[PDB]
Amino acid sequence: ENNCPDGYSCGYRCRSGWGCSGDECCGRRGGGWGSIELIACCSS
Amino acid sequence: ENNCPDGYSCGYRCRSGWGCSGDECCGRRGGGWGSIELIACCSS
Amino acid sequence: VGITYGYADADSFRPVEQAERFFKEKLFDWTSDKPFGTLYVLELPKMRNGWDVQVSATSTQFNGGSLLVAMVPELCSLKDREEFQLSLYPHQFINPRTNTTAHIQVPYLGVNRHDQHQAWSLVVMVLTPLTTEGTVEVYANIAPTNV
Amino acid sequence: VGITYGYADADSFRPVEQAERFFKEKLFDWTSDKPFGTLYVLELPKMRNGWDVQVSATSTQFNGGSLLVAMVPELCSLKDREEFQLSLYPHQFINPRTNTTAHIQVPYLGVNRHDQHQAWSLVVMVLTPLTTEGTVEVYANIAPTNV
Amino acid sequence: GIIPVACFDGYGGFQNTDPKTADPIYGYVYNPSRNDCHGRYSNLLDVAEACPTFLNFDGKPYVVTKNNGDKVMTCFDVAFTHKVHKNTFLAGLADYYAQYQGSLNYHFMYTGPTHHKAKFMVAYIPPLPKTPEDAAHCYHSEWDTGLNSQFTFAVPYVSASDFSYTHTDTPAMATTNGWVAVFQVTDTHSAEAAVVVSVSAGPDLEFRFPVDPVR
Amino acid sequence: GIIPVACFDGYGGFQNTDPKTADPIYGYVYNPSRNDCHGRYSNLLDVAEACPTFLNFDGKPYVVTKNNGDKVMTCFDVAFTHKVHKNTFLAGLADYYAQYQGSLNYHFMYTGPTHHKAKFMVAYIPPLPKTPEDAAHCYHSEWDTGLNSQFTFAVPYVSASDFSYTHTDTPAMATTNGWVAVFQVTDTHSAEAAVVVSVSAGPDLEFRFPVDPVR
Amino acid sequence: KRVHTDVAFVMDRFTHVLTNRTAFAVDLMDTNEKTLVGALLRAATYYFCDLEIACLGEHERVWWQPNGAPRTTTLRDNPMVFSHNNVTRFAVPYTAPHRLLSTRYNGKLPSTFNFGYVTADKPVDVYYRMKRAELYCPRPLLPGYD
Amino acid sequence: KRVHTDVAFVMDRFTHVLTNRTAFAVDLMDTNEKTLVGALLRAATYYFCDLEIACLGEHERVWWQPNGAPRTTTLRDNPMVFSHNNVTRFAVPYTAPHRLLSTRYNGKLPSTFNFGYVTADKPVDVYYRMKRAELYCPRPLLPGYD
């Protein structure tokens, strides 16, 4: 199962400043228009 | 290396009155509009 | 809770920038006497750069409230009923029980590719009045990115 | 420094004519008393032929200045600020320290394929006044080509 | 060698919405690009779906918990012309469209102390009794503020006609659009709290027939 | 058997820049050829790139070296409306175009005695201090009149907008276009000399929107 | 699939912007702030379009100068269109030096945010049409009427 | 790629050359020396083009005679175009005997440098347009206005 908090899904490339090896982050479309929120990495 | 002075490049056919065996002269665009300047032959 | 990238590019997130400088400043005393709509606008800066602001508050388990922290591009003025649609901008919510800390990052935005002109303005609105069961302070950390 | 072929054909130089006659004439005494813009215009001739003019000057290591030697096609008159754009024509520079000798060759030019009508005019302008640390004279050698 | 034509009467007048284009003046202009720009939106309702906007509960977006025994905090219609939705982006966007159809998503956020946990139920009452037992036979859902202080309540489209009217006049009509109401199931209220309510367009909502209100 | 058409209103007026052609009178004329003609140019800016034209330094194209200690022979803007560029072919060509963008090449020629060797540096000061040390952090280049008495100083386009305005009014404004200035690094000046300055269009310069000035 | 709420569809309309003017700038902020075209435009921070201008009235001809051209009382050989049936419709290309125009500016909008200058022989009624509109950074939108 | 500085693009424009004339030569040097077309034409020693003549005004018909034809008061069966909506537009071929025309001549320009003769029933205003213009031997160009 995907290891992300509630409402967070993988498939979002991690931006600079997270240090995730897999380059997959718990993205979440929200915060405005076009805003993308990253909270942690993705582990499978 | 090409044997032409600074700013002069080969690939210009020598016009009549230069005596260049290879028909390659150190051409140089300049001196007006459409003007072509020849100073010597090209040796490779 | 997390980091918000306003006006992000969809292709760029399909499976660089960083903060160069730093700064801190107190904004206001979050108190129950301020009802909904108590705006606090901070123009930025106070070079084709994107901003990165970490608005934080000092709240305990006995503190209750909500702040709407957003970055309005070119905020000339805010009308009477324009506060309710402030969520149309890159924003985050500060709840003492949920995150108690905001962090928004926005790219360079303007008509031209080089800026002089307050392109971005950090606006903090008291969404709900503070509730308790001892003062709450708000500190903003602003850092330009990719100058 | 070299030989300038005004209005040359690009294809013709991708990898014939020659001077038939000859002539020499002194033009003017190049002296410091003449400031910038001291024009000297010589119509040619003084048969569908191209011209070949070798303007030369007598300058030593202690002589300094600059002459702009050009061939203007159909130079009816020159306006007040037109001199500054003379470099739009087949031209060369005579500098005492660089070449001290000019050589320009131009083809036949006209509305028709046979000429009567001063098609070309050799113009010499004093781009910078003469400087020394003993007079400088200018001699023009004109020779028709492919008559 | 001449093509015979016939200039019909009726066509040719200046239409302000004609599909035909005009003759350009500088027809050889080439603006560089706008591909790497930020915030472009090609559809208005796409903006409304992703950007919830707050409601107007007498000048405030939140609801104060009542100590008296009523089990009801708010009872507002689902009409874009109602004073509750007056400040939303959807109502502002609905003012320029004649008709609409689709669902609405209502977002509820609890902004109270972390120690105080309360359980709320959200009920939709299609076109009316105001009790949870009568709402059991109707559409309803319940969320507890101990797992997520953020609840989404999708409101289905149950209007009789295929499309509804954006412009109307119904203050508290029993058949306005469904009377979304919020009930608190816990009578053991401790202190004052707040519930921020906002509305965003559903994935299937669709406005149509753009119009200019000159009311 | 008749094609139904509709003569629209708005189109049909005489436009002075319309793409449509007219009906010829003598439609079977055949002018022989113009292939072997000399001097043909099909683009105005191609002429401006290959034909540098001199600048106007108070009626003269050259600059006189000063004995006093100032280290600044000239300090002229990069505006086509400036009096320095007034006589150039580019300024004459820029007067008929609304906007432009691209780089300029400035040609410098030294016309002094061969025995006297001087070293000059050319600095570009984007929108301002007039010292070589402060110009080190800015764009600069240095050429010595002992190798080639001919220097080309490309001026990059650093305007805020994508395109600049050909017509403006800035006498010595600090943000005009970059304040090209010439500094002589050798304080051991011997005697009077001259430096001929001319400007030619860069390979990337581009004018747009032809305009008839009726000022 | 939603069509009638598409930005490229809604803004593609002729909106009445000003009445009885002989010489006027082609700034896109002259639109009425309550109209459909004029209110959704102000709900965007930036925009870009190829404007179409229609002049209705008793006028022989109309002129148009591109943005940045000097303002003069008399226009000679500038882009000129003659009226047909008292209507003059002509497509004005995007002309401003900036990559994008803006409805707001935190610095009144400067004069560079316009599509040119238009002078008419006699006063006319003007209609603007945004061809291929591209809005950016949506802004709050409020009901014009209650 | 630069388009708006192309000669074939710039010279392809109707320029007002003369006002209220009934019979006139079609000398392309009649253009105003300060307009775009006239100024860029005078910046070249030689040129060649196929013209378009547009006459605006109350007139019934326009006669055109090719270069070299004798000048007579009355024209019969010569190339004649009737006006439509008080506009007469027609394309004139390059009728000069020379291979190229010249703006300057180191001999005033002789009468052979024109595109013909034009007569009108009533005085008209005339616009010239250079189709497929070719320019040779560029000449100094100066700013018309300061």
Author numbering:
A (entry chain E), B (entry chain A): 106 to 149
C (entry chain C), D (entry chain 2): 30 to 44, 55 to 85, 101 to 170, 174 to 190, 196 to 209
E (entry chain H), F (entry chain D): 1 to 127, 134 to 221
G (entry chain B), H (entry chain 1): 26 to 132, 163 to 201
The authors write:
These so-called ultralong CDR-H3 antibodies project the CDR-H3 from the usual paratope region as an extended beta-hairpin with a folded ‘knob’ mini-domain at its apical tip, stabilized by a network of disulphide bonds. In this study, we identify and characterize a novel cattle ultralong antibody, Ab117, that recognizes a non-linear epitope on disrupted VLPs and non-intact viral capsids.
From 110 210 classified particles, a final map to 3.2 Å resolution was reconstructed using C5 symmetry. Only the knob and hairpin bearing the tryptophan residue are visible in the density; beyond this, the density rapidly fades away, although diffuse density in the 2D class averages suggests that the body of the Fab is positioned away from the pentamer and thus less constrained to C5 symmetry. Fab117 binds the internal surface of the SAT2 12S-dissociated pentamer at the quasi-threefold of the icosahedral protomer with W138 buried in a deep pocket, so that all the interactions between Fab117 and the pentamer lie within a protomeric subunit. Four disulphide bonds, between residues 109 and 131, 115 and 147, 119 and 130 and 125 and 146, stabilize the knob in a 1–6, 2–8, 3–5 and 4–7 configuration, and this sub-domain has a further extended hairpin loop of 12 residues projecting further outwards from the body of the Fab, at the tip of which is a tryptophan residue W138.
